[PDB]
Amino acid sequence: HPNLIVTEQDVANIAASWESYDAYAEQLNADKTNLDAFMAEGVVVPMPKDAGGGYTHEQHKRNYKAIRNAGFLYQVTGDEKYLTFAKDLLLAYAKMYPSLGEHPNRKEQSPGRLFWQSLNEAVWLVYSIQGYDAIIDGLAAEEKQEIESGVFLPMAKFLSVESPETFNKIHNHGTWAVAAVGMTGYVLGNDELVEISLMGLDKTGKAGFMKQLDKLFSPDGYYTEGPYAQRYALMPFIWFAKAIETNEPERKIFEYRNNILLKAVYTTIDLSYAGYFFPINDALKDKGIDTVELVHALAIVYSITGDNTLLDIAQEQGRISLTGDGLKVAKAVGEGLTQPYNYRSILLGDGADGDQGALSIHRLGEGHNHMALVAKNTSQGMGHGHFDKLNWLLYDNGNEIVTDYGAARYLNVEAKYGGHYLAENNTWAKQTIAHNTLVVNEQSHFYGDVTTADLHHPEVLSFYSGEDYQLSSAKEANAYDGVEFVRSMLLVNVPSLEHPIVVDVLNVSADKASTFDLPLYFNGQIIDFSFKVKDNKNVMKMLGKRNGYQHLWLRNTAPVGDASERATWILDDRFYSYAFVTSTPSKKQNVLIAELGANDPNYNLRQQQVLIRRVEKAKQASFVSVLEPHGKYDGSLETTSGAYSNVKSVKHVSENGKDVVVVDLKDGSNVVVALSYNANSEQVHKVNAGEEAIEWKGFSSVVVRR
Amino acid sequence: PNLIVTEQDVANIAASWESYDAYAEQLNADKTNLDAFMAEGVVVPMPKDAGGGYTHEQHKRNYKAIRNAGFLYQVTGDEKYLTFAKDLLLAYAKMYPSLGEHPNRKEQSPGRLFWQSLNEAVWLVYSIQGYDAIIDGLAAEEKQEIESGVFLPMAKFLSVESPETFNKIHNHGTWAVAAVGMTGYVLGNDELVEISLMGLDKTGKAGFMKQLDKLFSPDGYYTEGPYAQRYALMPFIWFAKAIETNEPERKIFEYRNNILLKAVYTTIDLSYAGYFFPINDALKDKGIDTVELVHALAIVYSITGDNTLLDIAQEQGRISLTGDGLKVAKAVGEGLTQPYNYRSILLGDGADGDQGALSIHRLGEGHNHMALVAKNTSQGMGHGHFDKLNWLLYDNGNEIVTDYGAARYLNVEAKYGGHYLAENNTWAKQTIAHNTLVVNEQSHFYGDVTTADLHHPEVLSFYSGEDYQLSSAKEANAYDGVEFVRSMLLVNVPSLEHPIVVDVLNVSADKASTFDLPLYFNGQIIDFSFKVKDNKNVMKMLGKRNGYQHLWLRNTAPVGDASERATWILDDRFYSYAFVTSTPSKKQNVLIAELGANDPNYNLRQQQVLIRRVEKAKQASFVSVLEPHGKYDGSLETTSGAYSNVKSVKHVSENGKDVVVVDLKDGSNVVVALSYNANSEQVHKVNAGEEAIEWKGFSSVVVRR
Ligand SMILES: [Zn+2]
Ligand SMILES: [Zn+2]
């Protein structure tokens, strides 16, 4: 004792050398200052009363932090006042807990006692037990007795044996519950609670931590709900594994399932850009890598691995894990061991077996502010998932360029619907029209039905990442009745251009004449269009009536035809040009510029623009586009350059289900992108375009012609 | 070298430049770039095109290269740099004599190398510094060819051949006399120096000496505003540097009670968190790292030794590549940096500081304090905004209540050639675009510059104490039969987390009127206290003229007797605006509007407004509280104090006096009382909710039980 997240050996190293590292010491001092201010108010442990961001919810949260913090500071400073505060808090908890029935303010959510929902109960336990672990050696037997029989054992019982619908769950709720009961298990030397936590109530292994490790991540370490949920999962996964390693190294917890726990941490990093997680599915955009779960998880992974590329990420976090593992990060950074993070292009297979679609992340360029394309070809992700199959995002120059809205929610802001998911979360954020992907007949994928959406995943047709270019291709055959669409996205290295270009090819076939809309949510200020807007007559009307369209205002229409069109915007010091053609047998084709804010009486939606390509009355359509970063605007030194697009035009020709795209560059050269949709790498292909024939090996080829 | 850099300077730089990392990095970066530009040979094309075209951009690169080559030659000794500078100047000597006015000569006084003579003077101010640095490694016949081919001809053209520009009391005159004046010092030509200091007569009625008396107010304020002030700062401070280096006996940096030092300190005082207050025509991305202020800060540091400027120097993260700049880098390396002292100041406007004023009110530690800007200034001519008594608020490192600046995309060709756009007049200038009063949907002075030029607001009061701060000012000429008066306070309430803004704008008209008072806020709405009427799924254009045709009406809501509230979030902080209008009229509404109407070219940014409207009225008092509060942390997932601490806001008018009561949620209140009488001994009496408030002076603020 302590022998959990921190060992005795760890506290010795901490005590010996913590004052020697500026950042670690600053952060440890901050936590100390703040706890001291909290101690100054005495032992305040009220009766459970409120939910959400209500008083007793928050107080009981402050308390479990103090219990862990005081335990830790007592170990580290040797100072007695920290022991007696943690002790006194725990005793007040011991002499209140056995009297508690279910919380007065429960929901349909599996109730708690201390808290409105048992999730928070389990978090209270995961934190508190660490404080107790740090405090046991300084306690008399009748004190321990009151604590263990009063709070811990009854709480472990409640979250396990009395709550099987939760403790047995193959869900995050389950992970927090087993982590809490299992960690309690270790501190108390209670084999039952460990076995229960590892193998489920019946100890069959049909539930429990091990099954969670098998089921909640894909083999690559991807969590189906997305990064925003993935970083939350990480805390109970990593902390319990730490506990397991600290007490039963012979289980080889960090080796289990080809290092699934290592891969889950790296994957969490690989799902961020410039400090923030890709806001796909239900996600808030300000959640980033300095999040407490990833701070701890990184220290732990560094500690296991000695990977010095993690020191880079740890610096970008600018926040360190106040633990043994964290000290090792602080030490290593001090010694100048930091190597640059290797951002890889990766295919994250979705589902327990990584076969239910995939998320692709394509990376190109040096440092943190490189170019990243995300192709969201994933399964639904259940209730939190968005209706956006084949959606994409693009990041460049430290910014989001082509965007995902995330969730409609303001965390712990009471006046914003108690800080809950807003009505506009279903009404807008989830809807296909809010995403950069195909909308057929103004209806969401799977008609907005989560039950239908749960049944299906996209089909990944190809993934490739070389020095020449990078590709992801996927098919959606189930989003709408008698409709199939295919999207391929490429990042291309064109040596004559300053930055790589995105090439997008989206094919749709319908059985019946339909409207096909393809949005692009861009970030930045419009410079000019190549098309000519129709006068809006000094009014903007709601765009359409259902499935998200009721939140958009129509600002302008503009007619479009055979030749590619262009939009160019600036964002900070760079311009982005979007050049698009749509091959279709139909002759009704428009561009709609729209703006978020319709049916938003509560000002819940933020300001946003979109450019929507519309095709009416079509059975077929190939949406093609190039997105090109270019130029330099320096408002400080008062220079501009490269402000005009270097893409003269874009042409598309299709033959025998094969696609060819020619990007005509202004310097007279051109880029040719060719897609066969055939996986055989040796198969040869031939396409008669307008004027010329093109030929290649494989699913795809990209060549630059002078 | 005896102009901007001296012989001793170059020795200091040569000896030590390598040992100062940031200086070295920037010097190397400068060197790396000039190297790459050299590689492309000596391009000196015939004058052809204008601002943003090829030839215009080429000659700009040249004068910068000439200065930079010259400087690096001196610092490194590498003749490579001398050769390039020599040859560029030699081609200029071979071409300039056989040149009439530029092929794109406008009604705008023309140049020969450039479409206007301004760019010519800038050329010469840069090019003559490079020549000054190259003299050593030159032979008499080259010097003769250089001086006779470009410098002397150019100097004749910019002065004696162009009296209208040269005797102008305007930035155009400052550049021209800086050019010719420094050409005069390098070439040892006494005629050219005197002509630049004292005008073509030598009488003193024009030239640099008048410019120093006329173009700044005694506080060091330039009337067109911070954006124009930063740019003016260059030729003023560079010529003064040349003056000081050659003729220290003129005591140029002492002149007019250190006018030049004051203009540099004032430029810094017109900025927040790195950026200049975007009042009048201004780009919002223009900040303290502009080349003009980097040099001027360095020069002023070398003269003053004020270690306080080293704090600013760090915020600029860009050091002047000169000897003065070297002294800053050394000072910083020694750990001499002191925190800059941000004072609340009254900046009198006009030559004499009497034509209105610009108040800046500051409060808090560090750079990200709270700053209130009250724009009670004169017009500032054609770049001026029709926005008398406008205001701005900055807090927590952000702009909270905002000014649009200009509609313009600098050097972006596909945005009207980088020119001021049609919406600059139609929107950016209009009163409706600003946080101040609009009578009958019409702009101040009916949107007429000539009339606006005739008048300035009257400053009633300025005060700044530990207790509160105030600026109050009267506008009597904005419209026929209308008179208005605004007072802005920052009030320290010890029980509150942050200072508080209190605002009182009285209006008075002959005829029954519409009174609009916009608030352009930055952030996301949390909630309102009032109830919006359903917009029925259309937004229409808000009005037909004077900026109104640019806004969309998103919602109306009705209001009356009681105060209302709008709360919004910006980064980690909440802002609550509580408001009440005392008027005889019973027809008050609040409008939420959005920018973007009549903007087919997408020249305007996305922007929301809260507009307080009062129809059929002859009197109105609009009263506000802007309250910053709380903490939102998305990283740690905690929120605190998201709810306003202001229960309500009540206002009462007596015998042309005003009492404002702000009731706090905790049962306490704050009383603000305004007499409008300057005499500090005069006692005053108002009755509230039949409670009597008595105080002395122009104003009083009490925090009660
Ligand atoms: Zn989404
Ligand atoms: Zn303005």
Q: State the DSSP string of A412-436.
A: T-TTTGGGSPPHHIIIIITSGGGTT
B573: left (phi over 0), alpha (psi -120 to 50) or beta: beta
Cis peptide before A2 (omega within 30 of 0): yes
CATH, domain range A344-704: 2.70.98.70
> CB under 8 Å, gap of 24 or more: what pairs does A249-258 form?
A254/A304, A256/A210, A256/A213, A257/A213, A257/A214, A257/A219, A258/A219
Q: With contacts defined as CB-CB under 8 Å, which chain A residues touch B601?
A: 528
Q: Determination technique for this PDB entry?
A: X-ray
Please tell me the distance in Å from B455's CA to the nearest CA on chain A.
Answer: 33
Measured CA angle at A264 (ends A261, A267), to 5 deg: 150
> A541: CA distance to ligand 2 center in Å?
30
Q: What is the rounded distance in angstroms from the CA atom of residue A117 to the CA atom of residue A165?
A: 13
> B364: CA distance to ligand 2 center in Å?
26
B511: left (phi over 0), alpha (psi -120 to 50) or beta: beta
| Structure-token match 């396990």, residue found | A160
**Nearest Cα to Cα of residue A279 among A81, A435, A513, A433:** A435
A633 touching B (Cβ < 8 Å) = yes
HSE-up of residue B3 (Cα within 13 Å, Cβ side): 30
- B 555-614 residues with CB < 8 A to A: 555, 567, 569, 592, 594, 596-598, 600-602, 605-606, 608
> For the purposes of burial, counting CB atoms within 10 Å of the CB of A537, is it exposed (0-12), middle (13-18) or buried (19 or more)?
exposed
Q: Do A643 and B526 touch (CB under 8 A)?
A: no
In this structure, are residues B646 and B576 in contact, taking their beta carbons and an 8 Å threshold?
yes
- B 263-292 residues with CB < 8 A to A: 283, 285-287, 289-291
CATH superfamily of B1-340: Chondroitin AC/alginate lyase (1.50.10.100)
Q: What is the rounded distance in angstroms from the CA atom of residue A273 to the CA atom of residue A283?
A: 14
Q: What is the rounded distance in angstroms from the CA atom of residue B588 to the CA atom of residue B570?
A: 28
> A338: CA distance to ligand 2 center in Å?
48
Beta-ladder partners of A670: A664, A705
B381 touching A (Cβ < 8 Å) = no
In this structure, are residues A462 and A505 in contact, taking their beta carbons and an 8 Å threshold?
no
Q: Do A542 and B537 touch (CB under 8 A)?
A: yes
| Structure-token match 């810094």, residue found | B268
Ranges assigned E (strand) in A140-231: none
> For the purposes of burial, counting CB atoms within 10 Å of the CB of A47, is it exposed (0-12), middle (13-18) or buried (19 or more)?
exposed
Residue to mutate among B118, B316, B606, B645, with most A CBs inside 10 A, is B606
Q: With contacts defined as CB-CB under 8 Å, which chain B residues touch A539?
A: 538-541
Would you call B274 helix, strand, or coil by DSSP? coil
Chain breaks in chain A (C to N over 2.5 A) after: none
> For the purposes of burial, counting CB atoms within 10 Å of the CB of A640, is it exposed (0-12), middle (13-18) or buried (19 or more)?
buried
Q: Provide CB contacts within 8 A for B158, sequence distance 6+.
A: B117, B120, B121, B124, B165, B166, B176, B179, B180
Q: Do B639 and A413 touch (CB under 8 A)?
A: yes
> For the purposes of burial, counting CB atoms within 10 Å of the CB of A414, is it exposed (0-12), middle (13-18) or buried (19 or more)?
middle
We find that the CATH architecture of domain B343-703 is Distorted Sandwich (2.70)
Closest listed ligand to the CA of A434: 1
**Nearest Cα to Cα of residue A123 among A57, A71, A77:** A57
Would you call B116 helix, strand, or coil by DSSP? coil
User: Which residue type sits at A341?
Assistant: Y
Residue ranges per structural domain of chain A: 1-341, 344-704
> Resolution, rounded to a tenth of an Å?
2.5
Per-residue three-class SS string for B169-219: CCHHHHHHHHHHHHHHHHCCCHHHHHHHHHCCCCCCCCCHHHHHHHCCCCC
Residue B511: count other Cβ atoms within 10 Å of its Cβ: 11
Q: What is the rounded distance in angstroms from the CA atom of residue B520 to the CA atom of residue B539?
A: 19
Torsions phi, psi of B696, nearest 5? -105, 145
> A432: CA distance to ligand 1 center in Å?
8
Q: Supply the Cα-derived Rg of chain A in whole angstroms.
A: 28
> A450: CA distance to ligand 1 center in Å?
14
In terms of DSSP bridges, do strands B683-687 and B692-696 run parallel, antiparallel, or are they unpaired?
A: antiparallel
- A 468-507 residues with CB < 8 A to B: none
- B-chain residue closest to A292, CA distance: B636
Structure tokens at A639: 């220079």
- A-chain residue closest to B415, CA distance: A527
> A237: CA distance to ligand 1 center in Å?
26
> For the purposes of burial, counting CB atoms within 10 Å of the CB of B533, is it exposed (0-12), middle (13-18) or buried (19 or more)?
exposed
Q: What is the rounded distance in angstroms from the CA atom of residue B472 to the CA atom of residue A650?
A: 60
CATH, domain range A1-341: 1.50.10.100
The overall longest dimension of chain B from CA atoms, in Å, is: 92
List, as one string, the DSSP characters of B293-323: HHHHHHHHHHHH--TTHHHHHHHHT---SSH
Q: Do B635 and A288 touch (CB under 8 A)?
A: yes
A523 touching B (Cβ < 8 Å) = no
Q: What is the rounded distance in angstroms from the CA atom of residue B515 to the CA atom of residue B517?
A: 7
**Nearest Cα to Cα of residue B375 among B281, B262, B459, B499:** B459
User: Which residue type sits at B451?
Assistant: T
Q: Do A419 and B594 touch (CB under 8 A)?
A: no
Q: With contacts defined as CB-CB under 8 Å, which chain A residues touch B553?
A: none
